[PDB]
Amino acid sequence: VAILWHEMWHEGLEEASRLYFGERNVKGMFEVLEPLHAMMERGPQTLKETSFNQAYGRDLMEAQEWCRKYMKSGNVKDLTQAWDLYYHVFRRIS
Protein backbone atom coordinates (compact mmCIF):
# COMPACT_ATOMS: atom_id res chain seq x y z
CA VAL A 1 0.00 0.00 0.00
CA ALA A 2 1.46 3.18 -1.46
CA ILE A 3 -0.63 6.31 -1.00
CA LEU A 4 0.22 9.99 -0.73
CA TRP A 5 -0.58 11.68 2.58
CA HIS A 6 -2.62 14.29 0.55
CA GLU A 7 -4.87 11.44 -0.72
CA MET A 8 -5.22 9.51 2.54
CA TRP A 9 -6.36 12.72 4.37
CA HIS A 10 -8.76 13.93 1.61
CA GLU A 11 -10.49 10.57 1.58
CA GLY A 12 -10.32 10.07 5.35
CA LEU A 13 -11.80 13.59 6.22
CA GLU A 14 -14.59 13.06 3.67
CA GLU A 15 -15.44 9.67 5.14
CA ALA A 16 -15.15 10.76 8.82
CA SER A 17 -17.37 13.82 8.13
CA ARG A 18 -19.97 11.56 6.50
CA LEU A 19 -20.11 9.30 9.52
CA TYR A 20 -20.27 12.18 11.97
CA PHE A 21 -22.53 14.81 10.18
CA GLY A 22 -24.53 12.49 7.95
CA GLU A 23 -24.81 9.43 10.21
CA ARG A 24 -24.44 10.95 13.68
CA ASN A 25 -21.82 8.23 14.28
CA VAL A 26 -19.04 9.74 16.44
CA LYS A 27 -17.47 6.32 17.21
CA GLY A 28 -17.04 5.64 13.44
CA MET A 29 -15.59 9.20 12.89
CA PHE A 30 -12.88 8.54 15.52
CA GLU A 31 -12.20 5.15 14.15
CA VAL A 32 -11.42 6.79 10.82
CA LEU A 33 -9.39 9.79 12.12
CA GLU A 34 -7.20 7.97 14.75
CA PRO A 35 -4.91 6.04 12.29
CA LEU A 36 -4.53 9.19 10.19
CA HIS A 37 -3.23 11.14 13.09
CA ALA A 38 -1.05 8.18 14.22
CA MET A 39 0.71 8.28 10.88
CA MET A 40 1.55 11.99 11.30
CA GLU A 41 2.79 11.09 14.79
CA ARG A 42 5.26 8.63 13.32
CA GLY A 43 6.76 11.41 11.12
CA PRO A 44 7.26 12.05 7.38
CA GLN A 45 9.56 9.63 5.48
CA THR A 46 9.34 11.08 1.95
CA LEU A 47 9.90 14.60 0.52
CA LYS A 48 6.11 14.66 -0.41
CA GLU A 49 5.20 13.53 3.11
CA THR A 50 7.50 16.21 4.54
CA SER A 51 6.01 19.09 2.51
CA PHE A 52 2.44 17.87 3.40
CA ASN A 53 3.50 17.84 7.08
CA GLN A 54 5.05 21.33 6.74
CA ALA A 55 1.82 22.83 5.27
CA TYR A 56 -0.87 20.98 7.26
CA GLY A 57 0.86 19.30 10.27
CA ARG A 58 0.15 22.04 12.80
CA ASP A 59 -3.55 22.47 11.78
CA LEU A 60 -4.10 18.72 11.96
CA MET A 61 -2.36 18.51 15.35
CA GLU A 62 -4.66 21.37 16.58
CA ALA A 63 -7.79 19.57 15.19
CA GLN A 64 -6.65 16.54 17.21
CA GLU A 65 -6.24 18.67 20.40
CA TRP A 66 -9.86 19.87 19.99
CA CYS A 67 -11.06 16.30 19.47
CA ARG A 68 -9.15 15.27 22.62
CA LYS A 69 -10.79 18.24 24.39
CA TYR A 70 -14.17 16.85 23.48
CA MET A 71 -13.24 13.39 24.74
CA LYS A 72 -12.80 14.83 28.17
CA SER A 73 -15.45 17.66 28.09
CA GLY A 74 -18.51 15.96 26.37
CA ASN A 75 -19.21 19.35 24.71
CA VAL A 76 -19.97 19.04 20.91
CA LYS A 77 -18.69 22.63 20.33
CA ASP A 78 -15.20 21.32 20.97
CA LEU A 79 -15.66 18.80 18.10
CA THR A 80 -17.08 21.43 15.80
CA GLN A 81 -13.86 23.46 16.36
CA ALA A 82 -11.93 20.43 15.21
CA TRP A 83 -14.08 20.23 12.02
CA ASP A 84 -13.33 23.90 11.15
CA LEU A 85 -9.58 23.05 11.05
CA TYR A 86 -10.25 19.75 9.27
CA TYR A 87 -12.36 21.50 6.56
CA HIS A 88 -9.66 24.24 6.06
CA VAL A 89 -7.16 21.37 5.46
CA PHE A 90 -9.60 19.55 3.21
CA ARG A 91 -10.26 22.60 1.10
CA ARG A 92 -6.49 23.35 0.80
CA ILE A 93 -5.81 19.75 -0.30
CA SER A 94 -8.65 20.01 -2.80
Partner: protein, 107 residues
Protein backbone atom coordinates in the same frame (compact mmCIF):
# COMPACT_ATOMS: atom_id res chain seq x y z
CA UNK B 1 -37.70 28.08 -2.40
CA UNK B 2 -35.01 30.73 -2.88
CA UNK B 3 -35.76 34.34 -3.73
CA UNK B 4 -32.85 36.25 -5.43
CA UNK B 5 -32.99 40.06 -5.04
CA UNK B 6 -30.17 42.09 -6.72
CA UNK B 7 -27.87 44.32 -4.65
CA UNK B 8 -25.58 45.17 -7.67
CA UNK B 9 -25.97 43.83 -11.23
CA UNK B 10 -23.60 41.38 -12.83
CA UNK B 11 -22.80 41.36 -16.51
CA UNK B 12 -26.12 39.68 -17.42
CA UNK B 13 -24.32 37.30 -19.81
CA UNK B 14 -21.92 34.99 -17.94
CA UNK B 15 -23.79 32.52 -15.80
CA UNK B 16 -22.34 29.40 -14.04
CA UNK B 17 -22.54 26.05 -15.77
CA UNK B 18 -22.92 22.76 -13.90
CA UNK B 19 -19.49 21.53 -12.97
CA UNK B 20 -17.90 25.01 -12.92
CA UNK B 21 -16.26 26.35 -9.80
CA UNK B 22 -18.00 29.48 -8.57
CA UNK B 23 -15.83 31.89 -6.56
CA UNK B 24 -17.99 33.97 -4.18
CA UNK B 25 -17.98 36.17 -1.11
CA UNK B 26 -20.83 35.66 1.34
CA UNK B 27 -22.34 36.76 4.66
CA UNK B 28 -25.03 34.51 6.16
CA UNK B 29 -27.60 35.37 8.83
CA UNK B 30 -30.80 33.90 10.24
CA UNK B 31 -33.91 35.81 8.95
CA UNK B 32 -34.17 38.75 11.34
CA UNK B 33 -31.53 37.20 13.47
CA UNK B 34 -27.88 36.58 14.06
CA UNK B 35 -25.12 36.73 11.44
CA UNK B 36 -23.53 33.33 11.70
CA UNK B 37 -20.79 33.43 8.97
CA UNK B 38 -18.96 35.61 6.43
CA UNK B 39 -16.10 34.78 4.12
CA UNK B 40 -15.33 38.52 3.99
CA UNK B 41 -14.10 38.44 7.63
CA UNK B 42 -11.76 35.69 6.67
CA UNK B 43 -10.41 37.67 3.71
CA UNK B 44 -10.67 34.40 1.68
CA UNK B 45 -13.38 33.72 -1.01
CA UNK B 46 -15.36 30.55 -0.85
CA UNK B 47 -15.33 28.22 -3.84
CA UNK B 48 -17.71 25.42 -4.64
CA UNK B 49 -18.55 23.38 -7.71
CA UNK B 50 -22.01 23.97 -9.04
CA UNK B 51 -24.18 20.91 -9.47
CA UNK B 52 -22.20 18.47 -7.21
CA UNK B 53 -24.52 18.82 -4.16
CA UNK B 54 -21.69 20.29 -2.10
CA UNK B 55 -23.93 23.08 -0.80
CA UNK B 56 -27.57 23.55 0.22
CA UNK B 57 -30.22 23.55 -2.48
CA UNK B 58 -30.96 27.26 -2.22
CA UNK B 59 -27.34 28.03 -3.12
CA UNK B 60 -27.40 25.54 -6.02
CA UNK B 61 -30.49 27.19 -7.49
CA UNK B 62 -29.74 30.71 -6.31
CA UNK B 63 -26.19 31.01 -7.62
CA UNK B 64 -27.10 29.35 -10.95
CA UNK B 65 -29.23 32.36 -11.92
CA UNK B 66 -26.53 34.89 -11.08
CA UNK B 67 -24.10 36.33 -13.57
CA UNK B 68 -20.42 37.18 -12.95
CA UNK B 69 -20.10 40.38 -10.91
CA UNK B 70 -23.60 40.23 -9.47
CA UNK B 71 -24.20 40.74 -5.76
CA UNK B 72 -27.56 39.41 -4.49
CA UNK B 73 -29.60 38.81 -1.36
CA UNK B 74 -30.77 35.17 -1.36
CA UNK B 75 -33.68 34.35 1.00
CA UNK B 76 -33.86 30.59 1.45
CA UNK B 77 -36.74 28.71 3.02
CA UNK B 78 -35.82 25.89 5.52
CA UNK B 79 -36.65 23.18 3.00
CA UNK B 80 -33.99 24.63 0.65
CA UNK B 81 -31.53 25.01 3.54
CA UNK B 82 -31.26 22.72 6.66
CA UNK B 83 -34.93 21.85 7.16
CA UNK B 84 -36.40 20.43 10.31
CA UNK B 85 -33.07 19.20 11.67
CA UNK B 86 -30.99 22.35 11.27
CA UNK B 87 -27.21 22.31 11.28
CA UNK B 88 -26.05 21.13 14.74
CA UNK B 89 -24.68 23.81 16.96
CA UNK B 90 -25.27 26.61 14.43
CA UNK B 91 -28.66 26.64 12.59
CA UNK B 92 -31.91 25.72 14.49
CA UNK B 93 -34.76 23.57 12.99
CA UNK B 94 -36.97 25.38 10.53
CA UNK B 95 -34.72 28.43 10.05
CA UNK B 96 -35.10 30.77 7.05
CA UNK B 97 -31.59 31.90 5.94
CA UNK B 98 -30.58 35.08 4.23
CA UNK B 99 -27.26 35.26 2.40
CA UNK B 100 -25.50 38.17 0.74
CA UNK B 101 -23.58 36.51 -2.14
CA UNK B 102 -21.26 38.15 -4.62
CA UNK B 103 -20.25 36.02 -7.64
CA UNK B 104 -16.65 37.01 -8.18
CA UNK B 105 -15.33 34.62 -10.87
CA UNK B 106 -15.85 31.25 -12.48
CA UNK B 107 -13.06 28.65 -12.83
Amino acid sequence: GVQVETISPGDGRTFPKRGQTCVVHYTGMLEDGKKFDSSRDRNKPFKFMLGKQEVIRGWEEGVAQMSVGQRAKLTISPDYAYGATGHPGIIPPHATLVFDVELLKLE
